[PDB]
Design a protein around this ligand. Sequence first.
Ligand SMILES: Nc1ccn([C@@H]2O[C@H](COP(=O)(O)O)[C@@H](O)[C@H]2O)c(=O)n1
Length: 201
Amino acid sequence: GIVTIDGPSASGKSSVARRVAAALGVPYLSSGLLYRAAAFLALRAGVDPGDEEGLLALLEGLGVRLLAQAEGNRVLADGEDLTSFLHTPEVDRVVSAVARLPGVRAWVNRRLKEVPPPFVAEGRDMGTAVFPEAAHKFYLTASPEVRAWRRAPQAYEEVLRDLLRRDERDKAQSAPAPDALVLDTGGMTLDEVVAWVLAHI
Ligand SMILES: Nc1ccn([C@@H]2O[C@H](COP(=O)(O)O)[C@@H](O)[C@H]2O)c(=O)n1
């Protein structure tokens, strides 16, 4: 089955998912590799990383695959393993701009939905429901003050104002899925949240 870990910004959802997967001996689906793959393919093909229709045609055309493995995921394009090229400074430079294109996000989400279970992943991509039928859903919540507090401490004021905007922006998603098990992480360490999650699976 699929285990999903969701929550607001700076909720520690990714760190938790990575530990949960590691403990279960399953892969953790980190979206970053696919966005990097998209950037890489764009730069290699001479396709402007700002040209969405051109990039999408290229990505869909090549047939991209996320090989999920407990020891580390791989990304293949037309059967070629590109994984070792995804963290260079040229890819780093344009990857964010690429990830801001809505059609690329949808492409990434479709690549995520093709991976055969089991694995741990984030159930949502902002307002998009990526793994709505996962057998084990968990929602990690905490006050913006505690999330900001941990994120920083004088900077607390700044970090907080940022988190509050994202919370304001992401109002509709500031709630768990109907069948999600909720955990307030206030007063708990990373290891404690991980333990709590594993204990409810
Ligand atoms: N959930 C995610 C994960 C990564 N990304 C994009 O991919 C990049 C991070 O890739 P990594 O996580 O592998 O470092 C970020 O710059 C971000 O723009 C994203 O937009 N949404």
